[PDB]
Amino acid sequence: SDIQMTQSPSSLSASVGDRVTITCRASQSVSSAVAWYQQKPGKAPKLLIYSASSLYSGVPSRFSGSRSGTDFTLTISSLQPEDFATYYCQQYYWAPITFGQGTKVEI
Amino acid sequence: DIQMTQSPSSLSASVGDRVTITCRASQSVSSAVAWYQQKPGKAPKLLIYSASSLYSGVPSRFSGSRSGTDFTLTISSLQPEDFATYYCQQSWSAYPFTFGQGTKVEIKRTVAAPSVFIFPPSDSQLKSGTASVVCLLNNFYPREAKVQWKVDNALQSGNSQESVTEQDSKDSTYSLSSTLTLSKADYEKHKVYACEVTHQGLSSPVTKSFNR
Amino acid sequence: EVQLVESGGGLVQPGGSLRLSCAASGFNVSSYSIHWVRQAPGKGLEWVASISPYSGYTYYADSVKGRFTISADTSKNTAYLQMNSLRAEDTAVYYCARLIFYMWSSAMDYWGQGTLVTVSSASTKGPSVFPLAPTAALGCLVKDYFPEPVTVSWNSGALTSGVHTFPAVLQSSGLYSLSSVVTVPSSSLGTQTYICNVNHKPSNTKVDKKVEP
Amino acid sequence: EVQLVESGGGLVQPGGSLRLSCAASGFNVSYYSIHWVRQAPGKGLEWVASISPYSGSTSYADSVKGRFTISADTSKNTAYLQMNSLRAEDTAVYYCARYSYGNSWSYDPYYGAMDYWGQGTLVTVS
Amino acid sequence: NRFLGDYVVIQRTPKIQVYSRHPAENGKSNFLNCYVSGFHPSDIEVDLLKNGERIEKVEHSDLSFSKDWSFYLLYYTEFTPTEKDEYACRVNHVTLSQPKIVKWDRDMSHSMRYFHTSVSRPGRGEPRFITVGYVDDTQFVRFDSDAASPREEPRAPWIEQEGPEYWDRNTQICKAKAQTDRVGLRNLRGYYNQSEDGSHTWQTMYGCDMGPDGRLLRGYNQFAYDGKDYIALNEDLRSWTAADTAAQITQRKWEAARVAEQLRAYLEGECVEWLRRHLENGKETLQRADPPKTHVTHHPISDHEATLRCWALGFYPAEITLTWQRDGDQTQDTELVETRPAGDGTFQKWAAVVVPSGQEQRYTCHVQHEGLQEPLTLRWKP
């Protein structure tokens, strides 16, 4: 049974500088092996977080993730105009690798 | 090799200012850098060891930061007793344990005019056949002072040396000593000897003299 | 206390051999890395030779590799830098420094005062002391001595303020000279006695020339 | 500077076959397992296959298992994907992904990161 | 007493084994282990499972390696088995293409040496330097670069009785060895042509064998870069063996400086003398010998054929010989696992061989071990 990543909301609009959180849930107990990717239009995904919490080298410090049970939250502490993109959950704990359906943020 | 480099070679900052000393390494030495404090005529001492850590005992006014290949030492508040030279050192690769060219830290203060003295050549030296006139300047700032000798009103230049001392760690002033050497036979050939001192702290030179 | 006492300085003719000694007081050289850094003087520091604490791996700078032989004795708690074929550029003051190891860095914390080593083709000459008879300033005038490391203090150091022992300017004739002066109140002249205690270790001379008006 | 370049894209008729290429640069691919992921137009991201270049051990997603053969070349320092018996649904901008394995004997156990994705290359089944 | 080595200068698939420190009794406090061995490079994601949920508060051993420089770890955790609870170990490594899941199927002279590992981390700070000092199969010190306050820290019940002088000199050496190794890794990216984007390794090992005579039997000083022999010290303790062209460049550099001279002095002297002390201090455990406890189990994969397995449990020292024979020898067509560390100082192992059901009473397994006084032989017998 493939491990779907139920990611909601399908979209959400926030004003620049706002604090935004993006939830993500796994069909089983995926461990902290979860990473968050940012996909600007017509561009390849870029890693934001891995180990479900660790900021990836070079990524802005405002980005952060946190695991509570099997629910993963990607935090924007202060939204910036360069944060417009279809964000993605992911689980590489279990094979096959799968991603959430996405989260479209509108500015 | 890892040829360290300290910028600037010398810097004079008034007491209470913030002093920044940059030591850069020709290769990435990671976080292995140290800074040493040495006063003239004394043995160096260690301040910063693990590229930022302050040595146990050193005052908190010292601080050091790491950045890529650049390194900086920062003195929060300049103090009198901190007149010294600060050498950076990399322990990344022993053999060799390379040091920097060294930094000279000086205290900048108000212009302080000098006091001029003259010592007549003593009889003991004259009997031996040598004479030495000495002109003294005590506790004056800054380090520039033109000591123009004048004998019998005639300019005698080309037979003298100058020896400035180090900055006074207490007052932050300088002292100078200029000597004119003439053989005993020459001494008896002239009577009036004087030394002229022109300084930033003096509007006009103050002449000190004596007659045999 | 923990200290490092140098020794063995002085003058060695170009091409001679010397043996500096660095006594360790209160800490055994058998468990620390003794190094040797030399100053011109008047220039920056230069690392010379290091000996590893326990194994004994002796490393040397590229310039003195094979001429100098650093060692260390546990029984006497001393360290030596046996220098050979001394050149003109080896004139320097040598500091024997201890080393401390941190996780990802090391540094020298404890040092010694630093013995001077002069290398020149001239012989030893004693100091010619004269008194500079004179608020007022009194002093002496050391002259035509060799080598440089002379010390001048007044009245066994009982007087300390106003001292200005200028650096030794090397005269054109290849000899050193410096002026020792001190400022004291004019009202105190004749009530107190001042004598310059010239001390020349390389020539074993100690002349006290009293200074009066 | 680490940077991966993809090629082998264009057009293809349904049922045909194409050989995608993802030539790495700035790092030895043998240190990483190169994963292939595809994105249908305006849809989610689907994982395709992964190659461990040194040992050549490979795993394929069931959506393409039995049709896609992945390959790598350490000497050339590139990653290859063989697609056959193409289906209409296989339209996407294919990304080659660089898994970066972590460790757990650290005091703070890590997990690997799919740190570097390729720029992508369009592949239209039509 | 460590030696101050002050002289600067392949990928294996892990073999995952999930097992229990003792035979599993439902409801009885037991230890679950995930002993991954034979892998290289060092980085590996290991996590013990319980019904799909990751287990926290697990304990793992200090990184070491075998003779061939391949690493091994022991991830273990205190647990209690049951009927429902299924346990797996999720091991992931570069050689593997997906994480490997191994379900816990219930049925499945002397020498002081000092192993060091320096793993460069180009963007994650200073190199991860970990070093371990062994005596025979036992561990008695460790020094991790990333510990809170890096210090030579005891790992045996007989070494902690040493005084501060012991730990201050050992700690000084290790913080010197780390800085020596750190320099080595930097220069090896130069000798070869390697980008600064990859993490490499520099394993080093040295020690002093000591036969019963109490004198050095063979000194060791080896080095590996990226999991392959680099440069080694020959038995003569005077020359060097260079395994590749770059190892020749450095081999000359250590012949002119006569670095081998100091190694011989320590290896022939201080190295063996302390080994004798460690044996005298730790004579309780190092000089011990526990004979294996042997049991043979048979599980058929058919109504006429089966796999026969001979088990060796709770023996020390590690080295053991265990192989299958028909009528009394099957070196081929036999499966034999790497010796397993039980995590309490003892080890375990088993060997299996397929057999037709009939004439199984002809088969036998033979157990030879140092702690064993006489040869052993056994066969399955319900």
Q: Which H/E stretch holds residue E205?
A: strand E201-210
What is the rounded CA–CA span in Å between residue C79 and residue C20? 8
Residue B20: CB partners within 8 Å, gap ≥ 6? B72, B73, B74
Q: Does A60 touch chain D (CB under 8 A)?
A: no
Preceding amide of B205 cis, omega within 30: no
- DSSP states of E81-114 as a string? --SS---EEEEE-SSSSS-EEEE--TT--EEEEE
- DSSP states of E149-171 as a string? S---EE-STTTTTS-HHHHHHHH
Is residue E197 domain-resident? yes
Cα torsion A45, A47, A53, A59: sign: negative
In Å, how far are B104, C6, C110, E205 from B43, measured between CA atoms?
15, 11, 9, 40
What is the rounded CA–CA span in Å between residue B206 and residue E251? 73
DSSP E122: S
- B touches D, CB cut-off 8 Å, minimum 3 pairs: no
Residue C100: CB partners within 8 Å, gap ≥ 6? B49, C106, C107, C108, C109
In Å, how far are C145, E81, E88 from E85, measured between CA atoms?
94, 7, 10
Q: In units of Å, what resolution does this entry have?
A: 3.1
* B102, B176: one domain: no
Quote the tokens at residue B57. Answer: 């005992």
Tell me which architecture the domain covering C3-118 has in CATH: Sandwich (2.60)
Q: Which residue has the tokens 């390697």?
A: E194
* Residue in chain A nearest E123 by alpha carbon: A57
Preceding amide of E317 cis, omega within 30: yes
Quote the tokens at residue E125. Answer: 């700070």
Tally B–C CB contacts below 8 A. Answer: 136
CA atoms within 13 A on the CB side of E289: 12
The identity of residue E200, as a single letter, is: H
Question: Which residues in chain D are contacts of A54 at CB distance < 8 A?
Answer: 110
What is the rounded CA–CA span in Å between residue C92 and residue D47? 70
Chain-chain contact of E183 with B92 (C-beta, under 8 angstroms): yes
* Inter-residue contact D94 to D35 (CB < 8 Å): no
* DSSP alpha helix (H) spans, chain E: 164-191, 245-256, 259-265, 272-281
* Inter-residue contact B21 to B86 (CB < 8 Å): yes
E372, A77, A45: which is closest to D35 by C-alpha? Answer: A45
Q: Across the interface, which of E5, E165, E175 has its CB nearest the CB of C102?
A: E175
* E91, E240: one domain: no
* DSSP alpha helix (H) spans, chain A: none
Question: Which residues in chain B are contacts of C179 at CB distance < 8 A?
Answer: 134, 136, 163, 177, 179
Chain-chain contact of E90 with A95 (C-beta, under 8 angstroms): no
DSSP E5: -
Q: Does C101 touch chain E (CB under 8 A)?
A: yes
* E97, E115: one domain: no
What is the rounded CA–CA span in Å between residue A56 and residue A68? 20
Quote the tokens at residue A63. Answer: 């980005």
Q: Which residue has the tokens 């900048």?
A: B108
Judged by DSSP in three states, E185 sits in helix
Angle at Cα A88 formed by Cα A86 and Cα A91, nearest 5°?
170
* Residue in chain B nearest C143 by alpha carbon: B132
Show the beta-strand stretches assigned E in B69-129: 70-75, 85-89, 103-108, 116-119
* E66, E151: one domain: no
* Cα dihedral value E306, E307, E312, E318, nearest 10: 170
* B104, B30: one domain: yes
What is the rounded CA–CA span in Å between residue C49 and residue C32? 14
What is the rounded CA–CA span in Å between residue D80 and residue D6? 10
Query: Which 3-state string (H, E, C) describes chain C?
Result: CCEEECCCCEECCCCCCEEEECEEECCCHHHCCEEEEEECCCCCEEEEEEECCCCCCEEECCCCECCEEEEEECCCCEEEEEECCCCHHHCEEEEEECCEECCCCEECCCCECCEEEECCCCCCECCECCEECCCEEEEEEEEEEECCCCECCEHHHCCCCCCEECCCEECCCCCEEEEEEEEECHHHECCECEEEEEEEHHHCEEEEEEECC
Specify the length of chain C in residues. 213
B13, B35, B139, B141: which is closest to B83 by C-alpha? Answer: B13
Q: Does C31 touch chain E (CB under 8 A)?
A: yes
What is the rounded CA–CA span in Å between residue B80 and residue D101? 55
Q: Across the interface, which of E8, E126, E183 has its CB nearest the CB of B31?
A: E126
Q: Which residue has the tokens 């995590």?
A: E343
What is the rounded CA–CA span in Å between residue C181 and residue C198? 13
If interface means Cβ-Cβ distance under 8 Å, which residues of chain A face chain E? 28-29, 31-33, 57, 93-95
Q: Which H/E stretch holds residue B196?
A: strand B192-199
Residue spans in chain C of domains classed CATH 2.60.40.10: 3-118, 131-211
Judged by DSSP in three states, E30 sits in strand
* Inter-residue contact B37 to B45 (CB < 8 Å): yes
Judged by DSSP in three states, E277 sits in helix
Quote the tokens at residue B80. Answer: 């009198």
Last residue of a domain, one of E78, E103, E128: E103
| Maximum separation of any 2 CA atoms in chain D, in Å | 53
Rounded to the nearest 5°, which phi and psi values hold at B46? Answer: -100, 135
* E274, E298: one domain: no
Alpha carbon C185 to its chain's center: 33
* Residue in chain A nearest D110 by alpha carbon: A51
Quote the tokens at residue C29. Answer: 């050289």
* B60, B142: one domain: no
Buried b (16+ CB within 10 A) or exposed e, E155-193: bbebbeebeeebbebbbbbbbbbbbbbbbbbbebeeeee
In Å, how far are B12, B36, B51 from B65, measured between CA atoms?
21, 15, 7
* E247, E122: one domain: yes
* Residue in chain D nearest E146 by alpha carbon: D107
Tell me the angle at which helices E245-256 and E164-191 cross, rounded to the nearest 10 degrees.
130
Rounded to the nearest 5°, which phi and psi values hold at E188? Answer: -75, -30
Chain-chain contact of B99 with C35 (C-beta, under 8 angstroms): no
* Inter-residue contact E43 to E199 (CB < 8 Å): yes
| Maximum separation of any 2 CA atoms in chain B, in Å | 69
What is the rounded CA–CA span in Å between residue E71 and residue E63? 7
| Maximum separation of any 2 CA atoms in chain E, in Å | 70
Quote the tokens at residue E312. Answer: 């060796």
Last residue of a domain, one of E281, E309, E324: E281
Q: Does B117 touch chain C (CB under 8 A)?
A: yes
| Residues forming beta bridges with residue A99, ordered by sequence position | A90
* Inter-residue contact A106 to A44 (CB < 8 Å): no
Is residue E93 domain-resident? yes
Angle at Cα C104 formed by Cα C101 and Cα C105, nearest 5°?
50
Distance from CA of A48 to the nearest CA of E (A): 16
Residue B94: CB partners within 8 Å, gap ≥ 6? C50, C59, C106, E6, E179
* Inter-residue contact C139 to C182 (CB < 8 Å): yes
Residue C32: CB partners within 8 Å, gap ≥ 6? C24, C53, C98, C99
What is the rounded CA–CA span in Å between residue E45 and residue E300? 34
Question: Which residues in chain B are contacts of E179 at CB distance < 8 A?
Answer: 32, 91-92, 94
Question: Which residues in chain E are contacts of A33 at CB distance < 8 A?
Answer: 45
The identity of residue B176, as a single letter, is: L
Q: Specify the CATH number for the domain of residue B120.
A: 2.60.40.10
Phi-psi region of C8 (alpha: psi -120 to 50; beta: other; left: phi over 0): left
* E297, E224: one domain: no
What is the rounded CA–CA span in Å between residue C30 and residue C73? 8
Alpha carbon E13 to its chain's center: 16
* Strand arrangement of the beta sheet that strand E128-135 belongs to: E153-154, E138-144, E128-135, E110-119, E201-210, E216-225, E228-233, E240-242
The domain total for chain A is: 1
The identity of residue B37, as a single letter, is: Q
Residue E359: CB partners within 8 Å, gap ≥ 6? none
Q: Which H/E stretch holds residue B30?
A: none
Experimental technique behind these coordinates? cryo-EM
Quote the tokens at residue D96. Answer: 């080659």
Alpha carbon A57 to its chain's center: 16
Residue D22: CB partners within 8 Å, gap ≥ 6? D4, D5, D6, D7, D34, D36, D78, D79, D80, D81, D96, D118
Q: Which H/E stretch holds residue B41?
A: none
In Å, how far are E64, E116, E153, E279 from E143, measured between CA atoms?
12, 9, 6, 21
Looking at CATH, the fold of the domain delimited by C131-211 is given as Immunoglobulin-like (2.60.40)
Q: Does D111 touch chain E (CB under 8 A)?
A: yes
Is residue E287 domain-resident? no
Report the 10 Å Cβ neighbour count for B140. Answer: 25
Quote the tokens at residue D60. Answer: 């394929």
Distance from CA of B74 to the nearest CA of E (A): 24
Report the 10 Å Cβ neighbour count for B133. Answer: 23
Residue E53: CB partners within 8 Å, gap ≥ 6? A29
Q: What share of chain E is helix, strand, coil (3-state, %, to 5)?
A: 15, 40, 40
Chain-chain contact of A57 with E123 (C-beta, under 8 angstroms): yes
What is the rounded CA–CA span in Å between residue C176 and residue C168? 6
* Inter-residue contact B150 to B156 (CB < 8 Å): yes
Angle at Cα C70 formed by Cα C65 and Cα C74, nearest 5°?
160
Quote the tokens at residue E229. Answer: 């022999």
Chain-chain contact of E45 with D102 (C-beta, under 8 angstroms): yes
What is the rounded CA–CA span in Å between residue D7 and residue D26? 17
In Å, how far are B98, C46, C54, C72 from C32, measured between CA atoms?
20, 20, 8, 10
Quote the tokens at residue A13. Answer: 């609009």
Domain that holds residue E358: 293-378
Q: Across the interface, which of E4, E126, E165 has its CB nearest the CB of C55?
A: E4
Specify the length of chain D in residues. 126
* Cα dihedral value D54, D57, D61, D66, nearest 10: 120
Q: Does E176 touch chain C (CB under 8 A)?
A: yes
Alpha carbon C44 to its chain's center: 16
The identity of residue E21, as a single letter, is: R
What is the rounded CA–CA span in Å between residue E94 and residue D54? 9
In Å, how far are D40, D46, E167 from D59, measured between CA atoms?
21, 14, 50
What is the rounded CA–CA span in Å between residue B26 and residue D86? 56
Is residue E7 domain-resident? no
Judged by DSSP in three states, E197 sits in coil
Last residue of a domain, one of B51, B82, B108: B108
Residue A5: CB partners within 8 Å, gap ≥ 6? A24, A25, A26, A89, A90, A91, A98, A99, A100, A101
Residue C69: CB partners within 8 Å, gap ≥ 6? C58, C81, C82, C84
* Strand arrangement of the beta sheet that strand C69-73 belongs to: C18-21, C78-83, C69-73
Quote the tokens at residue E155. Answer: 């790992």
E32, E33, E38: which is closest to E13 by C-alpha? Answer: E38
Q: Does A99 touch chain D (CB under 8 A)?
A: yes
Report the 10 Å Cβ neighbour count for B45. Answer: 18
What is the rounded CA–CA span in Å between residue A90 and residue A5? 7
Report the 10 Å Cβ neighbour count for A81. Answer: 8
Chain-chain contact of D113 with A96 (C-beta, under 8 angstroms): no
* Residue in chain E nearest C65 by alpha carbon: E257
The domain total for chain E is: 3
Domain that holds residue A47: 5-106
Chain-chain contact of D110 with A33 (C-beta, under 8 angstroms): no
* Inter-residue contact E95 to D54 (CB < 8 Å): yes
| Maximum separation of any 2 CA atoms in chain A, in Å | 40
Residue B79, judged by CB atoms within 10 A of its CB (0-12, 13-18, 19+), counts as middle
What is the rounded CA–CA span in Å between residue C134 and residue C132? 6
Report the 10 Å Cβ neighbour count for D102. Answer: 19
CATH assignment of D5-125? 2.60.40.10
Chain-chain contact of D44 with A102 (C-beta, under 8 angstroms): yes
Q: Specify the CATH number for the domain of residue E365.
A: 2.60.40.10
